[PDB]
């Protein structure tokens, strides 16, 4: 069934837009670290950008990819315009949450979670 | 002892000045700030007691958290509280500032400004009347009256 495309027509143009947004985020991490006075490294920021891009690597719908890059542009322009604070930028890193157990034995020990 | 008497008199004098000269930061969030204006009004004139609004957090002694504290507002409130120099005090006003209030089970409301800043006085109501807020201010003054910093230091 034919559907109205948000952008990108097929998957190739969606991948192109993903690459453009990835370049935009990659060239912004030094500025983000400088302006927000982050105690993280530039390499850490670039790795976090790569990780956040990689968790959506299983998407096979061009419209979902277009919406994802739209929201990525939104949260990039929040970082560039310093609308965000260091609070949110470091919320990206989950620096205060305790490491959740992942093995069956530990999960059995701690509680009733699946 | 002579030194004990001297430090007791000195920190009686110090607590008197801080108690009698309270400068709330000009800071209100929601409907609870209207009762702050009515406490500033001629009926319950707060300027009698030495309580004067100052806009800059640097020139403020008390932060009256009067309104709902949201997730989008918490960093700014913490920032102004930090920029307030010491000694500094906090008076949460209304149900929203005390706990969650009408919006306790909300995705965008902080369930208590004491999750963000150390609160000295809690004023109950929705909104607390101007008299209730004045009672809270006088209770804060009486709490300041009991501080013994020089007396703690002398025996330290």
């Amino acid at each position: 069934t034919s559907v109205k495309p948000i952008f990108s027509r097929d998957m190739n143009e969606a991948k192109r837009r993903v690459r453009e947004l990835y370049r935009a985020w990659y060239r912004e991490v030094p500025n983000t670290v400088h302006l927000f006075q982050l105690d993280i490294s530039v390499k850490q920021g670039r790795d976090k950008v790569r990780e956040m891009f990689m968790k959506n690597a299983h998407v096979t719908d061009p419209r979902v990819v277009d919406l994802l890059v739209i929201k990525g542009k939104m949260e990039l322009e929040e970082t560039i315009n310093v609308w965000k604070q260091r609070t949110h930028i470091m919320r990206f890193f989950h620096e205060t949450e305790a490491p959740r157990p992942t093995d069956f034995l530990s999960k059995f020990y701690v509680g009733h979670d699946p | 002892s002579r030194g004990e008497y001297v430090v007791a008199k000195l920190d009686d004098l110090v607590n008197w000045a801080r108690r009698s000269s309270l400068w709330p930061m000009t800071f209100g969030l929601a409907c609870c700030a209207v009762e702050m204006m009515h406490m500033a009004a001629p009926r319950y004139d707060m300027d009698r007691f030495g309580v004067v609004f100052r806009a800059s957090p640097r020139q403020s002694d008390v932060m009256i958290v009067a309104g709902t504290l949201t997730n989008k507002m918490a960093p700014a409130l913490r920032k102004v509280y930090d920029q307030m120099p010491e000694p500094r005090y906090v008076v949460s006003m209304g149900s929203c500032a005390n706990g969650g209030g009408y919006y306790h089970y909300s995705y965008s409301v902080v369930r208590g400004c004491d999750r963000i800043v150390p609160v000295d006085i809690y004023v109950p109501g929705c909104p607390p009347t101007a008299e209730a807020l004045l009672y809270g201010i006088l209770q804060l003054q009486r709490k300041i009256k009991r501080e013994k910093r020089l007396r703690i230091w002398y025996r330290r």
Partner: protein
Amino acid sequence: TRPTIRPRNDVVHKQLSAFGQYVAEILPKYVQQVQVSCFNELEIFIHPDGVIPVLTFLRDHTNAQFKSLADLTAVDVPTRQNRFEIVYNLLSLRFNSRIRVKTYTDELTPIESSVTVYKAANWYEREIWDMFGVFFANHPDLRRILTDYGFEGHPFRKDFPLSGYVELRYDDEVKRVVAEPVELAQEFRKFDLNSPWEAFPAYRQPPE
């Protein structure tokens, strides 16, 4: 007299019905349905891509001068294929009337931005996007308006939990506000209030 029953206005009902027929005749390509509620409110259901032509007609037409955009919101009905229902409320000062225009969309289908018809549509559509996830194609500045910076999810959706997934606090170790998974000292006690006896026979649906 019936003091406890709202009086009705057949004159206004007939006028609204006539104007609904008028607009439906003028715009057959987009108008799907026309209704007049028994409390005299005209409601127009159109195709989602007729938004700009229908709104421009209702604004600029001599016999329909709906020069004011009273409101613009959306309604989430998950049981529908197109869950989101965009609603426009227009006010005509020249004829002292109000009209409602309703369209539909889902998560992945954009709706044309009506900032070129009404300037209030800018912030109204920003709020619709922020609270439901509906994307508006040609919007001068489409971004979040009400939620926190970096907030994930659209909270007015029916499937979004009331308390969300994260909550904020100040952590002394990191000297900043932190966001952590929501944890409630008292869980919101859900109440089942609906009575098992039908209240309004006029609205009874066929068993099907």
